[PDB]
Write a protein that binds this ligand. Structure first.
Ligand SMILES: [Zn+2]
Ligand SMILES: [Zn+2]
Lengths: 143, 143
């Protein structure tokens, strides 16, 4: 394969596919079509009033926060930790996590993932994939 | 295992170990001691008048340029390509590459690498590991 270089703005931002995510887009910067065969690099952005359903999975995250701030929701620690620019975050396999932003709050961050990514498990189970945002158990993690 | 969060400034910048590198430091942000067992995240900074010996190795790079600019030296393409902020770069296994900065030029960039990193091979072989900087074959890459 060949050396690839791409600027972030030349990768189209698409809405994330995870059901029940709000105001969250991503740009796949380096992926398996580029010859990456073990890990990949994706940029995410959570716009104001955004969230993803807290989940857990058998693939680790390494995260680097580029711009803005957001809440890292940590259901097994009963809390949400604010993260900001210049922070690296490792989330091991199995550890529940989700993202959130309030009004006026935007966050752009890199996620490094493996090529093989088994399906995620939701912390809050429901037919409606948005129901987590109205559950007391979730809202209490936000403080 | 456990979730780790670290701001870049809480990881001490150290000179890179590669012989013949100049003005190049790194901060290991997420590494194997943190429970990372497939890939790791390192921030590098090349300060002005800096360079690394062009090399090749059996491990791919995924790189994201955070601040400033530098030359990606590409020996198999007979050229040096200027890179800047917001750029993702993929460098396959075996492709030669090095970094360089001129007098007013500093660059801070993330490198994602595997845990297993066999020894690199220098493009320019010499006993003095700085000898590349004065070789015509190298300086003509810089164009
Ligand atoms: Zn996840
Ligand atoms: Zn290298």
């Amino acid at each position: 394969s060949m050396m690839k270089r791409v600027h972030r703005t030349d990768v189209k931002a698409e809405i994330v596919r995870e059901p029940g995510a709000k105001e969250t887009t991503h740009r796949k910067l380096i992926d398996t079509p580029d010859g990456a065969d073990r890990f990949v690099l994706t940029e995410f952005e959570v716009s104001p009033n955004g969230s993803t359903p807290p989940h857990f999975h058998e693939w680790e995250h390494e995260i680097y926060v580029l711009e803005g701030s957001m809440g890292l929701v940590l259901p097994d620690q009963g809390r949400t930790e604010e993260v900001g620019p210049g922070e690296a975050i490792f989330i091991p396999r199995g550890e529940p996590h989700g993202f959130v932003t309030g009004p006026g709050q935007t966050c752009r961050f890199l996620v490094v993932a493996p090529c093989e990514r088994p399906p995620v498990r939701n912390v809050f189970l429901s037919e409606d994939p948005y129901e987590y945002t109205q559950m007391p158990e979730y809202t209490s993690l936000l403080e």
